[PDB]
Amino acid sequence: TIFEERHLKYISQLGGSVELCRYDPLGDNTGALVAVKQLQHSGPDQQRDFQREIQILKALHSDFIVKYRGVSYGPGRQSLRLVMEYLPSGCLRDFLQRHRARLDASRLLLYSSQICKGMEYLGSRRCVHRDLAARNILVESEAHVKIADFGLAKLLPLDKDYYVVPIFWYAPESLSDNIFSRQSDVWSFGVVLYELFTYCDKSCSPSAEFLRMMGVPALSRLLELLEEGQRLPAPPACPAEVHELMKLCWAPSPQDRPSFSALGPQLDMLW
Numbered sequence: 001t002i003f004e005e006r007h008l009k010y011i012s013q014l015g016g017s018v019e020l021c022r023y024d025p026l027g028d029n030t031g032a033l034v035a036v037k038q039l040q041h042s043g044p045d046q047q048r049d050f051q052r053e054i055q056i057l058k059a060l061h062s063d064f065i066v067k068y069r070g071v072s073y074g075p076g077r078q079s080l081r082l083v084m085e086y087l088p089s090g091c092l093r094d095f096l097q098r099h100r101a102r103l104d105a106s107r108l109l110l111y112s113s114q115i116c117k118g119m120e121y122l123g124s125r126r127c128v129h130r131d132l133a134a135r136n137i138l139v140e141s142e143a144h145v146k147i148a149d150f151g152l153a154k155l156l157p158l159d160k161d162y163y164v165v166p167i168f169w170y171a172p173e174s175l176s177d178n179i180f181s182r183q184s185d186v187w188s189f190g191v192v193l194y195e196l197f198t199y200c201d202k203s204c205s206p207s208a209e210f211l212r213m214m215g216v217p218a219l220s221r222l223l224e225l226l227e228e229g230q231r232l233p234a235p236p237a238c239p240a241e242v243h244e245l246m247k248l249c250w251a252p253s254p255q256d257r258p259s260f261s262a263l264g265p266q267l268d269m270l271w
């Protein structure tokens with residue numbers, strides 16, 4: 001929960017910057033691999049942004065949320081970094097593309113259900129994620145996924161249900177009025193269901209398809225297209241039941257969107 005900087009051996013970059021270090025106190029190259037995050041931008045707003053990320057992760061205890069391992073300790077105030085666990089399989093985006101052939105619909109549904117239970121837990125703690133996408137979900141093992149990237153995550157105050165702060169994961173209210181809530185996370189979840197059932201194929205990615213349907217500023221056009229009720233199409237060979245759930249996640253009004261708690265049993269019955 002307090003890692004010495006001198007023992008954090010740099011290996012490569014993954015992602016503020018997210019690095020792959022080995023926590024090697026012995027200095028022998030046998031220590032555990034860790035995911036270490038730090039901001040390149042110095043400042044009082046940046047320090048607050050990164051302090052907020054740490055406090056959020058430190059109090060999150062789900063099997064479906066990337067494990068916080070601790071904070072760094074080195075020479076100077078500038079040396080402090082966030083230490084999380086490393087998942088060798090990497091992001092679900094790459095994993096889906098590398099292993100298509102062995103990932104069937106029940107498997108995609110098992111991941112969908114786990115992401116959901118994880119999103120359900122985040123709402124429980126009053127946490128809006130703001131960056132829910134396959135690129136931000138990590139593979140723990142064959143039948144296990146975790147939610148990561150808490151850099152844009154905001155905690156909702158006790159007396160409010162929303163927060164005022166790629167465009168293809170944003171809800172219509174986020175696009176027009178920069179309103180973020182658990183209801184906007186659900187919209188992003190529908191795009192995640194879509195990404196999963198497309199195996200994160202680049203040629204039918206939310207971007208490639210929405211831009212195709214699009215053709216004034218690009219954001220306004222997308223928002224016009226969404227206002228009209230146009231949506232991403234059902235992924236090639238997507239079970240119809242799965243596509244209906246995405247269309248509920250994509251309800252124009254936030255009150256109409258199902259809750260994560262409500263979506264959970266639906267994805268479980270589907271397997």
Ligand SMILES: CC1(C)[C@H](Nc2c(C(N)=O)cnn3cc(-c4ccccc4)cc23)CC[C@]1(C)N
Pocket residue numbers: 014015018035066084085086087088089090091094135136137138148149
């Ligand atoms: C927030 C992430 C999901 C990444 N962070 C990662 C974390 C973490 N704690 O945030 C943990 N394990 N991990 C493994 C990979 C990885 C990818 C490909 C290949 C191998 C390994 C990337 C990450 C950095 C940037 C990201 C992708 N948006």
